[PDB]
Specification:
dimeric, binds pyridoxal-5'-phosphate, about 450 residues, 2 domains, Aspartate Aminotransferase, domain 2, transferase, homodimer, binds chloride ion, transaminase, alpha/beta, phylogenetics
């Protein structure tokens, strides 16, 4: 890539999550990715970067997969697009639906509805929750409960579910009818609480919110098995059962937001099987295709599906569709993705190498004076940098310790993201990462963290 | 296609806009499209159908385009995906942004933000409208005004903008802060009003709504140049200027929803140039890629962009992104699409053959006893069937005249959609349609309408 392209970028391309002015003026320099293979990408300067974030928790089978590119091409040649309205389909979308339900989804899942992004999938979730209760004659039972630091999308309603302020700022979010309970981050639990007591606290807090709101008004609770963008927050021991006990008591649906965790990410089929969650609805995307083509999928459980089915006899077809729902080339990409996941036992690899990565991180970083917590689960991990480790005092956000450490990794040839609203270095590498590659990742992160500690301590 | 596939479809595939139970039980039969070429698709029975709806107003360059399939394949091989966050880009997305602004968008457009569906693009629009007013210190100026029969998406907020009840039913829509003004359908204007007086009426009605709500609370107005899913409602003479005069008077932004009308559909670059609209923000999708890959694009005018740019100096990066924003394969598909549109002068073809189609429809259907109105603009057209043509009395909706006529076309080998909330046969054929093909379309529609008139009159 090329200096004219960068002029045209600054003039006309509005990027996601990009400082509008600094990009436009060149102060935030652009970067063009020209190719990629395995766990590495190549920029316009010829730099090859080790990408320990797999794009955005999404390039799970690794880059450069000619198999998937050929599967997309064959579908694009045969039939790039027709709609899936009024019972229309491609072979590919039918096959994909059966394979998701049969090979990947938890017990009791039935139907799959397709979109393009995780955000449109959670938008679909909110509609299904309202529909379900309206057709069952419970018009007041509508509120959705999310969590502080949850990430669930970047729309109005989906941004409201999101529990990170940057997705609310100047958008007047959260909307009415979305409430937030605690982030279950045990490291930051009230002083004196052991893990069990903190879980007990989290459950009581949720219960009190349901009771304050009126249980007859509360429809669903949404949660990622492990919180991703909110900073790699692993649920404490017994958390999910404690939460599900509260929800069951007041007939609240569970939406498992599996956009990160599904399709081998935590070393399991999805996060729900790993973390003892029994969701009524599931959101997926990212790893569904390994980002080779855009696709999202809402997985509907038998209970909600049966009400949708029976209600349709009275109500006609549900008023829901996106033009590109079931897009054939996106289904073809997904099937090639699932083929590779299965054939190369990548889920088992993510368990093993993810266990290893987390271990090697603890070894390199536990007791490091800049690091307050090392954490993770499967092929997700994080370091959270703190000012006083034992008192759990963070740095002031303006010191930008997290962004600095991310930047220092990038100088040293590795991509690891500085997470929002804190000083946190996140890792979400391709699920095909080797143990050797994991050690490379830890080695570079360690050099980066050491560099920044020198500057800031 | 195949009987096992249909079993798996009924068991596991939740379709957009599909009677859940009747599909699942087989009463609503499924159909698998196995290929397509030109203006025709092929189903699992070998039937070749003339598709006068171009999928969903979207397959604009026609089916079977190996050029686009190869362009997708070449990008999928080189770099299927990386993100476009924090100033990252592909060559393709940069080129696309410059070409949209330079060759297709109206005067005064600057930046392009990418999504996957028209609905996520209007979701982005609502965020930009709220941001704009919040950063300008106008926290009350937030309400959006749409229109009865407008179609703007199938989410919560985007469904609220939509002015068709089927997208509201059991979803508790429209949300607060979305209001609807009149559908400007001159055929159904209050008795006694000539066209000029009706336009005058529509403007006063909008003004009264702004005044009732408080102009300081009203942020934007959204409208399709010609209303698509709402039934091919062409704006009356002087309508758009009358509306823009009201909006300008109270500093209300104009969002042009060009998801149907953009990229040659009305025989012009976009509907805005054709219909004297000067929008602050523009929504696009469908014809942006001719559906070869999913993509949406929000086109931001200089006025709104300049506030976003300057606000970022104080506020940091805007909290907005979708993981697949700028998806490379989708950009590659778009560029091949635009290449073909330009190279084959398809916009000029849409003007000519669309003019012809509308003329031939008027000839075949004006005075037909089942038909209350023939209407259209460019390569969009509709027949609206009525019980009393002069008194403008419709059939009762339960007679399903529209669906019947659609079904009768389909028996005769042609796809033309029965539009929601009325008895309306819609046409939106590929922009590459020939005059001969247009005459085929009119001929089959005429036989279909005659058949249904025999049954119902
Ligand atoms: C990325 C993400 C989403 C939203 O997905 P998009 O494709 O960016 O809309 C939703 N939930 C979780 C947990 C995510 O990580
Ligand atoms: C189809 C359509 C949309 C929504 O597009 P999706 O891709 O289906 O979300 C929005 N506005 C108009 C005018 C449309 O025709
Ligand atoms: Cl495995
Ligand atoms: Cl032309």
């Amino acid at each position: 890539d090329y200096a004219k392209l960068f002029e045209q970028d600054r003039a006309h391309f509005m990027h996601p999550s990009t400082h509008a002015h600094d990009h436009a003026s060149g102060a935030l320099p652009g970067r063009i990715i020209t190719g990629a293979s395995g766990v590495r990408i190549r920029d316009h300067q010829g730099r090859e970067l080790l990408d320990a974030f797999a794009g955005l928790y999404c390039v799970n089978i690794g880059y450069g997969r000619l198999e998937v590119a050929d599967a997309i091409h064959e579908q694009a040649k045969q039939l790039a697009y027709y709609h899936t309205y009024v019972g229309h389909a491609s072979e590919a979308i039918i096959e994909l639906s059966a394979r998701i339900i049969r090979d990947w989804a938890p017990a009791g899942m039935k139907k799959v509805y397709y979109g393009l992004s995780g955000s449109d999938a959670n938008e679909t979730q909110v509609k299904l929750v309202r529909y379900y209760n309206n057709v069952l004659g419970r018009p007041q039972k509508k509120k959705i409960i999310s969590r502080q630091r949850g990430y669930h999308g970047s729309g109005i309603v989906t941004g409201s579910l999101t529990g990170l302020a940057s997705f609310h700022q100047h958008f007047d979010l959260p909307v009415e009818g979305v409430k937030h309970t605690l982030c279950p981050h045990f490291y930051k639990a009230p002083a004196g609480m052991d893990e069990a007591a903190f879980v007990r606290h989290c459950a009581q807090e949720l219960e009190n919110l349901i009771l304050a709101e009126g249980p007859d008004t509360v429809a669903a609770f949404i949660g990622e098995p492990v919180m991703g963008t909110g900073g790699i927050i692993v649920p404490p021991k017994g958390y999910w059962e404690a939460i599900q006990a509260v929800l069951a008591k007041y007939d609240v649906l569970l939406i498992a937001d599996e956009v990160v965790c599904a399709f081998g990410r935590l070393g399991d089929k999805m996060g729900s099987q790993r973390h003892a969650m029994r969701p009524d609805l599931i959101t997926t995307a990212k790893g569904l295709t390994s980002a080779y083509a855009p696709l999202s999928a809402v997985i509907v459980g038998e209970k909600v599906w049966d009400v949708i089915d029976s209600a349709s006899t009275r109500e006609g077809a549900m008023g829901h569709g996106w033009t590109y729902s079931g897009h054939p080339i996106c289904a073809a990409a997904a099937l090639a993705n699932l083929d590779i996941l299965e054939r190369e036992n990548i889920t088992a690899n993510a368990a093993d190498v993810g266990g290893y990565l987390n271990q090697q991180l603890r070894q390199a970083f536990e007791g490091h004076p800049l690091v307050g917590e090392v954490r993770g689960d499967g092929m997700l991990a994080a370091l959270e940098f703190m000012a006083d480790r034992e008192a759990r005092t963070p740095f002031d956000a303006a010191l930008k310790v997290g962004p600095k450490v991310s930047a220092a990794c990038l100088e040293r040839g590795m991509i690891a993201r500085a997470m929002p609203h804190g000083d946190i270095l996140g890792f979400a590498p391709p699920l095909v990462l080797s143990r050797a590659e994991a050690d490379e990742v830890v080695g570079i992160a360690k050099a980066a963290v050491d560099a920044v500690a020198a500057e800031v301590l």
